[PDB]
């Protein structure tokens, strides 16, 4: 993984040496070139992981997340290059520097061979997201959201540090391959109870688990578009990848331990979805949709069945792409109408036909329309949970209503009806926005043909 | 402030501290302590204002009481041992009296009551000296007496100091009181680890010395003493705002900065000796420390506080102060993490 | 930094150059007292350096090219607008007075540095010890509020107390009618708009507050309108003086060296001038401050330090 | 009274008035056209098309197809020698020592 870290460390002076008018083009070109070279990680096997050295390895689980991350960064640079056109050159270069550092941090975190390196890199991902949220955010109370995000993450992750150092001192190592070959069963003791809690609560915080999800409806709203995308499409999957790695080490206690937590999602993803039925802020609606999808991911990972794992990773990738596209749509509409109120801008189909088509495609991919990746993942999760127990189909099936009952609702109020009279600054669609949304959407429809590369490590 | 007299006084402080370091007799340890405090008294009377006299009076009273306790421990050790080598003591009362004497000297809670006051009333160079160089000698004294240190007393002092320092720094708005309570919390953090592995104590002492020196150097460079002027400094030099932001990020132990190096490795020596609740509790209090650190960076750089009109004249004059060792100590306080095993040189 | 404690160790003593002719002399008066040339005569009598009245662009004049910077970059206050509307909404009055006090403090710091270094006496007009007589003349005319008055009092209390008063002060006594007639005959198109009550208030604060304390803390001389013309009488009076008052008597080499160190750091002189006290006549929000700072950084000769500007023609920038 | 000095709210920038063929990239048309060219070349023509070509032709991914070919051998063996189709024990039972009780 030293063939990708050094290109980002060379991208850093590439955005610190360009002119004031050529930073965006050079950064976009070189990040797209790195995204093109990112496909060499697909040399995987059905039984072995692709190991490069003692510190970096990549199986069939971290590879789609890596590809999504360094495909999302050029999209981030496109999405955040208009509302920062009034900023200072030094602050613009600092913004690009934070984005490049965040991408480097993510691609170093996703390939961490040993778990302590993953933990320190996982906490190191806090700094640029917090800086972006508390600096380039628009609303007044963004400091509260940044403090809530940082403290939820740290209060989750410090018992994770204590448990990881305890495990390393107890058995001898934290390599994932060695722990795959030196695993030991954990008996049903209260020490193992608190060990499971310390190893899990950080990832339940960053997923987020229902009950501890309160850092999402704030930090997803007042943040800018790039911070919203990096919060919605990567870091939750970072927590999911960490939980997937950790849950190997905590058998067979989880079989009688994960009863509340699973069900803390198995009801929560109902009522949070109901919150999307009564939301006046579109970005909060997208954030709560992300909460519901991550609760489904929590259930799939915690029941630890194979089909659940495949559904979890497929829904992870599909929901990340869909939520990034929806956040870009919300940002474009907010730029056009200067308000985040959903009830304000109405009848946008009569003025913006192509944007209405993109809205329709994004809403259809959000409600798991087959044969998209989201339907594949959610269907695999439903099969696995029905294998777990019968009655839980109800707890999924009613969600099958409510998701549609908000998503098409989000499609209706913003697009269908008589248009607003006093709003007369709706410009035609920018080519930048259309390019960004096509770059969001077309990879999903292309991966719908060949999903076998994003179905997990055990396909 | 005669430069010859200031040079001689600084050399006397250095000589007293090194006499504490290099001696093999208890009397010479006390000699170095007495000469150090005697020569550090004029440092806190540099500006000649009554608040400095108040702070120096409180400091002298506390240090003299600690020194009298130190002779009580030495004379008891002489009674029960008949010898004067600086090593493990031969009496539990000697260890107890020595432990709270050094706690009084180092501002460890509940004997910390002079630290947030004295540092409030002295100039920033004297505050830097008191919070950086004064802590070196009793660390050596506590390192050389570790076989006879009672575990319960030093653990109670450590946890009380960490909790009290965090909760006291959670409220103050002055920079010097925040620095004092942060120093108290760091002192408790690196005295909690002393009995298990003193190399971690020395590493945390060096890291805290470097980071506090960077903080105080930035405060003297910006000529800022409260939160509001430190907010106002963004008109003068934004690079200094970036520097104080990154070193305050490092100050709360957030990776990938240098401040995450000691405390995490301190936890690496807590689970070796089968202790789990203790690093969690000190990590939560470190989160409190990071809360008021985050408040300071929110006031400083991550927002843009409203300024006054006279900044324009301050835009026509560069910083003429002797900004000494600021870049080296700023780099050494942020990007020293991949060189973590350098602590091996401290064995 | 050229002058430091190392120079004082090496023998750079400032009372080596402190002869009997090194005197700090400031002259005061009304708005149009005609003292402006009189001090110039002293500059050709005792050989002392003379400094003009600290204007808006004085800080612009001392550094850089010395050209007058535009009012947006420095000051953001005009005397013509003050003469037009003293009770204006934007508060030109107190902003102008605070800016002028800051400029006068810079002028006094430069004067003290020149006197301490070169050993030559310095003649000034309307020093920082005689500026509040303007501001009080505002407050008795209702031109400002009480909060502005106490903010100016706090600024003066935190700024003056680190300096020494001048040796001899000279006040020219010109009455209100003579001042108004001189203003009328001067011909400035905007100077008649002030009421004569402002000049009367200036004279009242001068003869009620300034003189009762400059008769104690320093040496004081007083002259009428016509006796200001006779330069030889004034220089004979100041040259035959017996200095017994003022804290210039008990000044050793250490205190003057500390004063020289403090006046050579221009940031240290003006550090306490702009204290974070939010009075709506002087505070400016983040957006305008950011815009004018980014515009000032784009000015030639000001983007970097004085020795490190390529666009103005400085060579060997890469070897410094 | 009056509050602190502050500029009024700047209006939103309508980009199409100063340029009838602008695309929401930059003020000047030439760098805007260069940005369009680079995004549509290195975003659709370079990464998407060659990426679809690459993922369409991974070299027999995860050996999975090979496994089918191996199955095409194995039952061909076990339908010739009369062995049962698939043993119910993954390992040889003769090399297992059960814990005696």
């Amino acid at each position: 993984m030293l063939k990708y870290i050094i290109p980002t460390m060379m991208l850093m002076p590439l955005t610190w040496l360009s002119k004031n008018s050529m930073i965006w083009i050079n950064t976009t070109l070189h990040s797209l070139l790195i995204s093109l070279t990112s496909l060499l990680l697909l040399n995987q096997f059905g039984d072995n992981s692709l190991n490069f050295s003692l510190t970096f390895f990549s199986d069939s689980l971290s590879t789609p997340l890596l590809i999504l991350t360094m495909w999302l960064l050029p999209l981030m640079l496109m999405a955040s290059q208009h509302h920062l056109s009034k900023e200072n050159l030094a602050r613009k270069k600092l913004f690009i520097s934070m984005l490049i550092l965040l991408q480097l941090f993510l691609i170093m975190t996703f390939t961490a061979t040993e778990l302590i390196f993953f933990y320190i890199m996982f906490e190191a991902t806090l700094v640029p997201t917090l800086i972006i949220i508390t600096r380039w955010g628009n609303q007044t109370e963004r400091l509260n959201a940044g403090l809530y995000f940082l403290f939820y993450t740290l209060a989750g992750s410090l018992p994770l540090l204590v448990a990881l150092i305890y495990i390393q001192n107890t058995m001898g190592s934290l390599n994932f391959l060695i722990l795959q070959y030196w695993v030991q069963p954990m008996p049903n003791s209260w020490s193992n109870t608190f060990m499971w809690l310390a190893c899990m609560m950080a990832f339940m915080v960053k997923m987020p688990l229902y009950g501890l999800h309160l850092w999402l409806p704030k930090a997803h709203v007042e943040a800018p578009i790039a911070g919203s995308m990096v919060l919605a499409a990567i870091l939750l999957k970072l927590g999911g990848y960490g939980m997937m790695r950790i849950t190997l080490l905590l058998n067979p206690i989880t079989d009688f331990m994960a009863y509340p937590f699973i069900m803390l999602s198995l009801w929560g993803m109902i009522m949070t979805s109901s919150i999307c039925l009564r939301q006046t802020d579109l970005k909060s609606l997208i954030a709560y949709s992300s909460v519901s999808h991550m609760a489904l991911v929590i259930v799939a990972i915690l029941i630890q069945t194979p089909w659940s794992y495949m559904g979890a990773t497929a829904l992870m990738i599909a929901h990340g792409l869909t939520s990034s596209m929806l956040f870009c749509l919300a940002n474009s509409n907010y730029e056009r109408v200067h308000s985040r109120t959903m009830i304000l801008a109405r009848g946008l189909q009569t003025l913006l036909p192509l944007m209405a088509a993109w809205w329709l495609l994004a809403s259809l991919t959000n409600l798991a329309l087959p044969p998209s990746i989201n339907l594949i993942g959610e269907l695999f999760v439903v099969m696995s949970t029905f294998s777990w127990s019968n009655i839980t189909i109800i707890l999924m099936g009613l969600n099958m209503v409510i998701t549609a009952l908000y998503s098409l609702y989000m499609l209706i109020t913003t697009q269908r009806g008589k248009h607003t009279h006093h709003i007369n600054n709706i410009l035609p669609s920018f080519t930048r926005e259309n390019a960004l949304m096509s770059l969001h959407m077309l990879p999903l429809l292309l991966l719908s043909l060949n999903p076998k590369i994003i179905l997990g490590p055990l396909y | 402030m005669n430069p010859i007299i200031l040079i001689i006084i600084l050399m006397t402080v250095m000589l007293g501290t090194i006499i504490v370091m290099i001696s093999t007799h208890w009397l010479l340890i006390w000699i170095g302590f007495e000469m150090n405090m005697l020569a550090i008294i004029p440092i806190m009377m540099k500006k000649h204002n009554p608040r400095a006299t108040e702070a120096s009076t409180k400091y002298f009273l506390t240090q003299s009481t600690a020194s009298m306790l130190l002779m009580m421990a030495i004379i008891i050790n002489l009674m029960f041992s008949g010898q004067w080598t600086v090593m493990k003591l031969f009496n539990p009362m000697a260890s107890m009296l020595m432990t709270m004497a050094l706690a009084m000297k180092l501002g460890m809670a509940p004997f910390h009551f002079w630290v947030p006051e004295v540092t409030q009333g002295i100039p920033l160079s004297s505050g830097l000296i008191l919070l950086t160089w004064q802590k070196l000698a009793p660390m050596s004294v506590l390192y050389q007496i570790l076989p006879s240190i009672n575990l319960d007393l030093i653990l109670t002092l450590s946890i009380l100091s960490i909790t009290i320092g965090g909760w006291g720094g959670l409220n103050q708005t002055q920079l010097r009181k925040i620095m004092a309570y942060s120093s108290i919390a760091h002192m408790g953090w690196m005295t909690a680890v002393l009995l298990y592995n003193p190399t971690m104590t020395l590493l945390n002492l060096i890291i805290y010395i470097i980071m506090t020196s960077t903080m105080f150097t930035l405060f003297m460079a910006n000529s800022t003493t409260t939160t509001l002027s430190l907010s106002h400094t963004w008109n003068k030099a934004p690079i200094m705002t970036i520097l104080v932001l990154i070193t305050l990020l490092s100050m709360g132990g957030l990776p990938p900065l240098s401040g995450f190096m000691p405390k995490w490795m301190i936890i690496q020596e807590m689970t070796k000796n089968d202790s789990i609740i203790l690093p969690t509790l000190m990590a939560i209090t470190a989160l409190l420390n990071l809360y008021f650190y985050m408040r300071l960076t929110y006031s400083t750089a991550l927002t843009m506080f409203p300024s006054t009109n006279n900044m324009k004249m301050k835009w026509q004059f560069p910083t003429t102060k002797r900004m000494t060792l600021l870049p080296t100590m700023t780099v050494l306080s942020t990007m020293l993490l991949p060189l973590t095993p350098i602590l091996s040189i401290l064995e | 930094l050229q002058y430091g404690p190392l120079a004082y160790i090496l023998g750079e003593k400032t009372t080596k150059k402190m002869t009997e002719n090194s005197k700090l002399i400031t002259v005061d008066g009304n708005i149009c007292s005609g003292k402006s040339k009189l001090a110039k005569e002293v500059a050709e009598k005792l050989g002392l350096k003379h400094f003009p009245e600290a204007g808006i662009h004085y800080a612009d004049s001392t550094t850089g090219d010395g050209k007058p910077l535009p009012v947006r970059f420095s000051g953001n206050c005009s005397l013509e607008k003050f003469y037009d509307d003293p009770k204006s909404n934007d508060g030109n009055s107190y902003r102008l007075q605070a800016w002028l006090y800051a400029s006068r403090l810079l002028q006094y710091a430069d004067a003290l540095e020149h006197l301490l270094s070169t050993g030559q006496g310095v003649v000034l007009e309307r020093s920082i010890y005689s500026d509040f007589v303007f501001l009080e003349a505002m407050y008795r005319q209702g031109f400002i509020r009480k909060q502005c008055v106490d903010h100016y009092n706090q600024v003066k209390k935190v700024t003056v107390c680190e300096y020494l008063p001048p040796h001899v002060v000279i006040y020219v006594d010109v009455p209100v009618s003579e001042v108004q007639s001189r203003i009328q005959k001067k011909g400035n198109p905007h100077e008649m708009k002030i009421t004569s009550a402002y000049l009367q208030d200036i004279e009242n604060v001068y003869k009620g507050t300034f003189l009762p304390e400059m008769s104690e803390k320093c040496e004081v001389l007083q002259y009428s309108a016509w006796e200001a013309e006779d330069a030889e009488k004034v220089v004979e009076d100041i040259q035959y003086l017996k200095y017994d008052k003022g804290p210039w008597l008990d000044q050793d080499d250490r205190k003057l060296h500390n004063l020289r160190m403090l006046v050579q750091d221009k940031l240290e002189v003006l550090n306490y001038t702009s204290i974070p006290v939010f009075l709506p006549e002087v505070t400016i929000g983040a957006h305008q401050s950011d815009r004018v700072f980014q515009e000032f950084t784009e000015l030639p000769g000001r983007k970097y330090r004085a020795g490190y500007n390529e666009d103005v023609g400085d060579k060997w920038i890469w070897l410094k | 009274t009056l509050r602190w000095q502050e500029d009024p709210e700047p209006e939103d920038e309508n980009l199409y008035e100063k340029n009838p063929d602008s695309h929401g990239y930059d003020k000047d048309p030439a760098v805007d056209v260069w940005n369009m060219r680079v995004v549509f070349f290195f975003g659709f023509s370079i990464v998407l098309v060659l990426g679809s070509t690459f993922v369409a032709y991974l070299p027999d991914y995860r050996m999975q197809e090979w496994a089918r070919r191996e199955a095409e051998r194995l039952v061909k063996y076990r339908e010739a020698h009369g062995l049962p189709l698939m043993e119910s024990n993954c390992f040889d039972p003769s090399k297992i020592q059960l814990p005696e009780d």
């Binding site: 009034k86 | 907010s231 409203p306 | 709506p280 | 709210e9």
Partner: peptide
């Protein structure tokens, strides 16, 4: 429209001797 910055109220909240 533009990014919000703290006004006089935030500073006077942070300007007291006790917070």
């Amino acid at each position: 429209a533009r990014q919000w910055q703290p006004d006089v109220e935030w500073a006077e909240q942070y300007g007291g001797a006790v917070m």
